[model samples]
Target: MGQQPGKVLGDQRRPSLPALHFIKGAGKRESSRHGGPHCNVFVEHEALQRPVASDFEPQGLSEAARWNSKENLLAGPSENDPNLFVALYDFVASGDNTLSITKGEKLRVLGYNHNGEWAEAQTKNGQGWVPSNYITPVNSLEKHSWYHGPVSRNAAEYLLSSGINGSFLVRESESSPGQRSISLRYEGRVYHYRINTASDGKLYVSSESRFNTLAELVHHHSTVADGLITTLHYPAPKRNKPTVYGVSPNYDKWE
Candidate 1:
């Protein structure tokens, strides 16, 4: 038989394929570069998946998380109002048609719908419609008395000492709005001071540095000025009953 069909050249039987070469004692770098014995040189890689930009967010978060993120930026309403308001009598709520309010309690008028008879107002209780007749309107300044007049020395001292820096105590004005009298009591008499405008149009109450700013004048008088009284510049008034009667005809008419 001419050369057997499945035989190696010059061999009696077929030989096995060449064996693979490996290093069993290679270090980490060598093992990484060329895989060590019983290890693969390159791994079979799997494709990695990624999230969409629109779909990316904190996982496992609930819908209420909006309150912590979005809703915190929304601040409701402002605190500024320039209009006047009033309440003349107690108004009780009747079947939710109106809001309840106390006598003389201030009400901010929101609007009027019922031909000005029933008006909408904001009260301490809530906002609702109320009878227009039950309220009397007044200017914001005229709504409250500015000061309780003529306090005792101890009381005045206590107020002055305990008062805040920007705050001021006043002696109420009975006749004139242009001139407001501020007072302090020492010993037994009440010393009065009025913020007067000078010829140079500066405001002051007996200090040397005339201030154009009312705040500066108040600050100066509150801290540094020494005991400015009503009669420091002008002599005290001499009361004449006949002259007073001639000047004011309806003076005695008031209770």
Candidate 2:
């Protein structure tokens, strides 16, 4: 209730914006040094950086700029699934029965009650009920711009045909069981980096940095480039068929 949880795009907008930030935001220092009258230039310069470090906004939808507006629950489509959800707003626990969740946090639904008004969800720390309406189904990785769930190595290459350096997408390993690959276009070629699942249920493209969710990993690479070719830049979102909220696997099995 008090804290504003981050949103999907909001999460990514903090999105390199802390691991979320690729570079320190030192506008205040420069603003004071350059005097207050010329402050707009630095402020606009910072705002202009949005497209460069972009992983897309929640409203950015996909490759297109559909609608740009603000709403607590996103106000567009209603996600009705019995499995998972991504919190769209922060839900502060008011009692022992409710859960405290911030926007962009993924939730796994264990059970629901009260005419679907509230859902019992599970997160990394604990499990508790949350306002069902405050979340949207993120069960499918397909909903994200970076996930290409079923694309092949060559197919991914074709999709990244534009060959923008640092342009990338994640694809399901076509031949491997329970494995995924990060397909990135760097320099003049495409590189495929395999993602390994840790024994503790975390994931890592590089040994030093591991994450609980794929989105976190992607966002990190966007800032550091890590051991990959370059910092992850534009995500090659699916541009053909309409994305379904139903792959049932990315965040499928829960503990």
Candidate 3:
């Protein structure tokens, strides 16, 4: 049972919101002997002879922001996929069933129990069951604004050869009625390719030539294209065996 908005408690005190705190000396300070007021134009400035030290430290996210972000991350598909990334913006502990998570920590979702509203995630700290609302998916971290969805082998190679590195942009095709077209700018020229699905049921740019995969097309172009320079700023197609960063089976360098 909740009281009315303006109701007083048994102690006869009216309900009220918390007060805002204003610490002393929280304003900008002037470095001068006569530091009262109206000294803005008279202040002398000097160039620093050496790097000045700063006492500033990065601040972490607020409690409410962290919890809200965590809730958004957890609102993903409930699957047992290890590749799914998640993070906690706040600590959640309920008796013995506790997950010692910290603010702004990363975790890989191992599984999710939507029925119970809990998620099993792994991290460098440890693995445990965290309230589903306490974490968010990590895909947002790897997402790139420049990436324009998946492209086909020929179109990808064409963009690479043309020195258009990064995401390929697309818009409703003016030439075709019911299709979209990918557009790219390279060497001061704008090239357009119609989007079409191949016999293999994959979306590709309309072209007379074809290849098994984007990598194959890229490799073929790289070999014969004269004076053609490929730009990694637009990343190449993925390989069969992906390279994991910061991990290797090789022996220690000193050994």
Candidate 4:
């Protein structure tokens, strides 16, 4: 049966799989060990109308039962865009066993929409859209790619800690319209990130690595201000200001 919008978020579209277990001399008893049906899984969302792809994803994602599993492989439109059109390969509806899911013809998808609207799904033949929340973003570089190993951290660590402190030549003088550099290195390891700033005058980092990058950091100047504090990086300054400023107003202002 189709789910109404009210019952769409949580367990509304849960597959009607039976929860059965056999106990010796105790007749048939239901075991809560697996948590009844798909208990180990949950709908993961980030914002409205978007599904967050898990760590196991990529462009060549195939049609499968469970969308997010280690074997599936996860990747996003960027480090910024929510997970959509990504691949999930590991846990299909029932441990990759489709005898029940196939039903001679039906395909079931267990995940949220890319827009963060939660919903479960089951379909026919070989095509359907499962919500994106069912997918989760994960480390694509750690064990899979070039491993430089790791180093310990201390307060005295400098630029070498944050990154190599090197620079890239912006590709070409004229910006490449539709090309992108997928990953970059930081603190001796590669990381994923997206770019673009908002008018709020604040830089928003959507996501980062688990242990290392999330640690303490000092963000430099944000905007260009000759006599003002600003980030010394890209999308340079747009305005200038005087050196003199203001003082705290109080009865004893001089002090």
Q: Kindly state the number of residue pairs that clash in model 3.
A: 5
lDDT of 1 by residue, 194-249 (tens): 65545444555665667654435444665663555421221111111112112445
Q: Candidate 2, residues 1-61: lDDT per residue as tens digits? A: 3332344233222221111111112211111111112121211111101111101111111
lDDT of 3 by residue, 68-169 (tens): 110122222221222234444465444233456665565554433322224445555545555543454433211222222223334434433544433234
Off by over 4 Å in 1: 1-169, 197-203, 207-216, 226-255
Model 4 RMSD to the real structure? 20.4
lDDT by residue (1-255, candidate 4, tens digit) is 533333222332233322212111211122111101223232222321111221111121121222221232223122222222322322244422221222112123333222222223333322333323233222212111211111111111221233331211111000111111112333344333322222321222333311111111112212223221222232111122113233677775465
Angstrom error at residue 21, model 1: 99
Q: Rate the local accuracy (lDDT) of all candidates.
A: 0.36, 0.49, 0.34, 0.23
Superposed model 3: Cα runs more than 4 Å off? 1-88, 139-255
Q: Can you rank all candidates by TM-score, best first?
A: 2, 1, 3, 4
After superposing candidate 4 on the true structure, give the runs of residues whose Cα lies further than 4 Å from its correct spot: 1-82, 85-87, 92-162, 165-255
What does the lDDT read for residue 104 in candidate 4? 19
Per-model TM-score, in order, reads: 0.26, 0.41, 0.25, 0.18
